């Protein structure tokens, strides 16, 4: 970890009315160090052991930013907030000890190769507390993302709530939205391009304009590839303004239309607000 | 070949100024000092450093080894004047109507 | 909010052939201001009221970046896109008015302490439109993240679709993947280290090599801690190439193997593509 100073600014009351070289001799010291933090932030600080971030091999800025990789010896010291780190615990489980932070202080960290395991756990000390974490949090997750945020600093109390996320995967929802069931009492909604998912799961809520009749069902669908169909399973049915134990407040029908999985949601009731939300999906790729 | 120069980008020190203004253009210079020529000179040239020449000081006679000059129009040699002319106006016959 | 100029660059045709001090006297003005945006971006702009981002107290760069905290008086003016902000509406609900943006223009904002409530809502005006939002969007969510992105600018029309996310939580999936059911007709898949979750929910889709036989079930599991077991609930069964109303196209079995929850997916059919995807999980931490 190459240490950065804060911003360090030049005196313009210097220069043309004062000794040029000297006041500049100072200014470079700033400027040089000044960009260092910049490039050390968005590039490998191990590039300082190189030409000191200079040359074509020198530290470059990543619009994505860079997650600084280092030895454990450096993280053996409380590591400052605001930093992006990438460390892989394949070698061993580590503690990443973090300074007492401030409200809003962030700590971003990742294991890119996902070497983190129980055999390769990751311990963290953010001083005086981490919300939800008694003592030091340990991280066994491969391809996880360590993000700390200090939600209280106060006087002595650095309270870090904690977020962590799998660095990869398919996290999107193909179809989420809301509409009102037409005067026709139905519609057809393209859900996803018929090829995007073998499985999806969605939740539709059909609610009256006055909100009294609101329809809810548990939608589990099997996309049928060869037949260009989608097989549904509905259950756990719930209602409020239901006037009949039969299909009520609306109806849920499915289809594949225009290379889209297309749900057809029909309500005998006019002025029914239906929010179509696909909560989870699945598709099959290659083996392995 | 002394120079009157630098302090570019209109920095306060220069006092060298073109002034567009008032329908006109005003161009000021500080007085010029010259010495140690050791030799017999005539004229003086203001040589635009980028090249060419702005104008020529004929110096009226011939001196040696030093020169000192002020602009009797108070250090500004040039005040350029566009005043009052229109080109176009011709005269032609006309029918008086009436 | 400390205002930034855009990039402002020095003339090298100056300097050694021209007046040194002057051309430099100008250059500093650039450079100083130039780093200001930089550090004001990645550090508190309220550090300008300090030594102007100078000194050790001065603005520092955050590889994570900094979400700029300010008064409402400043957000009482249309706030430029590209900015990261952190404001806490505990004091009061605020409008954050945003300039008309460009296609691709982003606005990032957070409430770190999550003071946002209905008592502490957050209003936003991004000029001329925000996709899906009639008028100004209000945000009552604690620990939310305000991210605007201008998906149309065009001539007058700044169209902002909108993303928002809980700043924290467990968002990972322990097991997601795909494989082909073996010539043995089954396999064992470590799902998560047996201790990672008390509850999980996953979706497996077993599809034939030719895709005609595709198996789907709704997998709800209860991890059994003391017995080192996992209790399943399967329902809402759906098929396509099913030749029998009994277990067909494949079978789903569970286990805990090698400190892993281990699903054993057995298909009498060879050449069955099974995509194992864990959609949702649950684990119990401490009270409160």
Curated annotation (Swiss-Prot), chains A, C:
A cellular component term, taken from the record's GO annotations? virus tail, baseplate
Annotated keywords: Coiled coil, Viral baseplate protein, Viral release from host cell, Viral tail assembly, Viral tail protein, Virion
Q: Which Gene3D superfamilies match?
A: 4-oxalocrotonate tautomerase-like (2.60.40.1680), Bacteriophage t4 gene product 9 (gp9) (1.20.5.960), gp9 (2.60.120.640)
InterPro entries associated with the record: Baseplate_gp9_C (IPR056391), Baseplate_struct_prot_Gp9/10_N (IPR008987), Gp9-like_sf (IPR036240), Gp9/Gp10_mid_dom_sf (IPR027411), Gp9_C_dom_sf (IPR027412)
Where does the record place a coiled coil? 20-80
Can you cite a GO biological process for this protein? viral release from host cell
Q: Which domain of life is it from?
A: Viruses
Instruction: Report the function annotation for this chain.
Output: Peripheral baseplate protein that is part of the tail fiber network. Connects the long tail fibers to the baseplate and, after virus attachment to a host cell, probably changes its conformation to trigger the signal for tail contraction. Involved in the tail assembly.
Domain comment, as recorded: The C-terminus is bound to the baseplate, and the N-terminus coiled-coil domain is associated with the long tail fibers.
Q: What is this protein called?
A: Baseplate protein gp9
What's the source species for this entry? Enterobacteria phage T4
Q: Which gene encodes it?
A: 9
From Swiss-Prot, chain B:
From the Swiss-Prot or TrEMBL record, state where the protein is found.
Virion
Output the superkingdom of the source species. Viruses
What does this protein do, in the record's words? Intermediate/inner baseplate protein. The gp25-(gp6)2-gp7 module is involved in sheath contraction. Involved in the tail assembly.
Assembly: Heterotrimer with gp6; assembles as a (gp6)2-gp7 heterotrimeric molecule. The (gp6)2-gp7 heterotrimeric molecule further interacts with gp25 and gp53. The gp25-(gp6)2-gp7 module is involved in sheath contraction. Interacts with gp8. Binds to gp10 homotrimer; disulfide-linked. Heteromultimer with gp10; a gp10 molecule is disulfide-linked to gp7 and the other two remaining gp10 molecules form a disulfide bond.
Identify its protein family.
Answer: Belongs to the T4likevirus baseplate wedge protein gp7 family.
Q: What is this protein called?
A: Baseplate wedge protein gp7
| Parent sequence residues shown | 542 to 639 of 1032
């Amino acid at each position: 970890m190459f240490i950065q100073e804060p911003k360090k600014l030049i005196d313009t009351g210097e220069i043309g009315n004062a000794s040029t070289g000297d006041i500049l001799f100072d200014g470079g010291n700033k400027i040089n160090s000044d960009f260092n933090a910049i490039y050390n932030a968005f590039g490998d600080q191990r590039k300082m052991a190189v030409a000191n971030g200079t040359g074509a091999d020198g530290q470059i800025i990543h619009a994505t930013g860079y997650y600084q990789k280092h030895s454990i010896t450096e993280y053996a010291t409380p590591v400052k907030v605001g930093t992006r780190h990438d460390i892989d615990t394949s070698t061993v489980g580590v503690k990443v000890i973090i300074e007492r932070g401030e409200l809003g202080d962030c700590v971003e960290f990742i294991n890119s190769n996902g070497s983190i395991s129980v055999t390769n756990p990751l311990t963290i000390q953010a001083i005086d507390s981490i919300k939800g974490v008694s003592g030091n949090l340990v991280v066994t997750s491969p391809y996880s993302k360590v993000t700390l945020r200090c939600i209280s600093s106060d006087n002595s109390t650095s309270v870090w709530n904690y977020s962590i996320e799998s660095m990869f995967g398919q996290k999107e929802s193909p179809a989420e939205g809301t509409w009102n069931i037409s005067t026709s009492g139905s519609v057809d909604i393209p859900l996803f391009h018929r090829t995007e998912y073998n499985m999806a799961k969605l939740l539709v809520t059909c609610q009256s304009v006055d909100g009294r009749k609101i329809k809810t069902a548990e939608i589990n669908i099997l996309v049928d590839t060869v037949n260009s169909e989608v097989i549904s399973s509905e259950y756990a049915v719930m209602r409020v303004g239901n006037e009949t134990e039969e299909d009520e407040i609306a109806n849920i029908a499915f289809s594949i239309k225009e290379n889209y999985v297309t749900a057809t949601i029909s309500s005998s009731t006019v002025g029914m607000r239906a929010a179509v939300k696909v909560i989870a999906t699945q598709k099959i790729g290659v083996a392995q | 070949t002394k120079v009157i120069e630098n302090i570019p980008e209109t920095s306060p020190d220069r006092l060298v100024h073109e002034y567009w203004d008032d329908g006109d253009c005003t161009i000021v210079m500080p007085n010029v000092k010259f010495t140690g020529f050791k030799k017999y000179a005539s004229g003086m040239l203001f040589y635009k450093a980028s090249g060419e020449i702005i104008s020529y000081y004929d110096f009226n006679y011939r001196v040696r080894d030093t020169v000192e000059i002020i602009w009797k129009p108070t250090e500004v040699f040039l005040k350029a004047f566009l005043q009052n002319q229109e080109h176009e106006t011709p005269w032609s016959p006309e029918e008086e109507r009436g």
